[PDB]
Amino acid sequence: VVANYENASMAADYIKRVSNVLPDIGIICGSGLGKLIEEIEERKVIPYINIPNFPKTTVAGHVGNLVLGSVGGRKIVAMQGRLHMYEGYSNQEIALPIRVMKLLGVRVLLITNLAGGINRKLKSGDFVLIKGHINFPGLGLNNVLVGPNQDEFGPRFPDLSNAYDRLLQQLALKIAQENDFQDLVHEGVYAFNGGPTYESPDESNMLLKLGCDVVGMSTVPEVIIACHCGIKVLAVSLIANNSILDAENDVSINHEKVLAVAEKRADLLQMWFKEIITRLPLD
């Protein structure tokens, strides 16, 4: 399936009919997150299997439901699990859900993920506001946009220099200062590693040389598709482990540890995002 205007519209119209929601804000829940979903008011749950051409989640900690409803007076659509390129899906399959969000009316997209810390300061449980990225697949001819351009969504050559909206980062940090957890909040550059192997110790050391603060296997594809069709983005990494110090201590990383960190910070991440949604500009 191609992520074109026609197929995106078919999916959006199904969602519109079954949920009756026209959302302004979209949300993506990373590995093991999805406690925000219990706070949605007047909610409607739509399994991905019922949506025309929507792919199935295959990773632990990614529930395949779309949830719509009200949060902080605003209407939202939330992905309770995301798709990843290491699963074997094509760039058209990864791009489709974001283009459905565009046609539903989404103007601001709030993204979460779990990631490894590269910067030596970062420890398990910390948050990183993403301010830029290094797209290793994109440099090496696996960019999500390789192929015919879908002109109804955006330009052949998008500029990514404001992909991570500056005012949204400032707002997120202001709310953290207001509630006295600004000591958990950093800003940083996100490296996209295709995966599914964790970074080797020498790959982590290289990323540190190159100026990356965190590394993970998601997010950059969706961010580029959002930027291409004019959707503003805020992206936050929850740090699962520090890869540099782990390698020095011969400490292993595994997906069970990742899911446990997500469970320990999910309530706070839910509160933070609810307040950001509430304070977003009405335009």
Added chain:
Amino acid sequence: VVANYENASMAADYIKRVSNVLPDIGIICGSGLGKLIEEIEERKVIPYINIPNFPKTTVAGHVGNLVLGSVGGRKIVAMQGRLHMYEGYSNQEIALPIRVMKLLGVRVLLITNLAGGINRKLKSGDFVLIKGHINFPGLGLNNVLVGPNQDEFGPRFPDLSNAYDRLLQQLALKIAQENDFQDLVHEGVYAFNGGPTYESPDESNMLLKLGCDVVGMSTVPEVIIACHCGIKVLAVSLIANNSILDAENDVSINHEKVLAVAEKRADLLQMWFKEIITRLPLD
């Protein structure tokens, strides 16, 4: 379609029949260039659509015609637009036109492109004689030569250490000194980014750390196919923008700005290449 001896020969024989030219020199015009095409004497224009298995150009500023004729007493074949891997074409489709040039008799290939400047010295309108490259797709398993080797054209494992002919660079610079525009001429390393997104600010900063002087989305595939079958290469980047200073000033890049820079320098680039063609060694 496979870029093998049989399919390359079919295309070359069509061209030979319709144009009656046996060219020694090949030319590739980058984005928005193609004013050299009006200086071709006794010219023959062949649309790509008429040539067996030739792909169609889909990018603005790339006209899909092959032009043959005389320049400076020598016989040439010029591509009035080029194919790019971000368009969705396979490595066999990108390689085919160069192997057609080989069978037509081409021994020297002169390449142009539009690119972003990484080196802080470079500004819009400058020229960079390419002296080497960093092939990010090739490092990451998307090299143009991955696949069965076509033995009639070259070796399984080509050496690229003289891919950019030293004496051609020296000749190009000598003519620029002769005509007092050597202050516009630099030498540099070209980074191949698959595209189609422009480099993010943090990707540009990384390229600067790694020793690259310019970055673009073309050229390295054709250069490797030429080197594989023994064709000498000169490659020149026309700088569209400086990506490092742009990111610092929050200045955006777009394809319209790219095409305008190409139009402002096209007459000089045409004069330069005509003189290089005229001065090339008769062997």
Added chain:
Amino acid sequence: VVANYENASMAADYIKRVSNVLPDIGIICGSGLGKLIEEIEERKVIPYINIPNFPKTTVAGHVGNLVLGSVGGRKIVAMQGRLHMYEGYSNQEIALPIRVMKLLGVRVLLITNLAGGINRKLKSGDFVLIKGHINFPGLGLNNVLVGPNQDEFGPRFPDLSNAYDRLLQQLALKIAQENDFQDLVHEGVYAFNGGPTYESPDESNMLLKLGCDVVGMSTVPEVIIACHCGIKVLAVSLIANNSILDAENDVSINHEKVLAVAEKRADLLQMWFKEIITRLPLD
């Protein structure tokens, strides 16, 4: 063909039936190596063409036979040539022979390859015990494990921090000290370049900046598949050339020089590996 439990079992059962060997140790011979094959006692030779779904070797210096027998009292299975991703094979085709080894009973895998030296100290004929790697295809979405996970062999997200067993490296170096060729033995980080072009001079210079000691076009795929299914690995590079000093001297590299270096060191590499096999722990 998919490298799943069923297809791996079919191949393993054929081998078991025709050879009658249940091997504990697996071996892979790199370009132009394969003199260890004459030292196998009570040996059985099985051409790859007879094994269900085994691919054919297409590179010079890679004989397509599996050899089983006794060495140093232990039972082994040796690949007399290996498959490479630059040949055009899929990640399922490259992974299959390692998963066959797993089902045959292999617990320790000893790997050889020919490579370019990056570290300025390394010269033709030297050996490098590999202690880590930088997987450029893996960073850029061409990891050997992209796709559905084959759960019978290992986890969705493998940790690679002990992929190169520390005690095996120590044992290999101890035997070299015992026999007074420790001056030929180094330790280093291996960069995986997809190929098939040799590294350009500027790519070699970049690898040196990034902390790599050697570069080649193999090994990292098999190492990840082995680590995924719990097989311990020792990997040794035989240095064919120093790419940094070659570029400075305008000295070319070619596959004939590679094969000649392999022939000059094959007897010593055979003796070394026989002694390592003999001294391996019985668990």
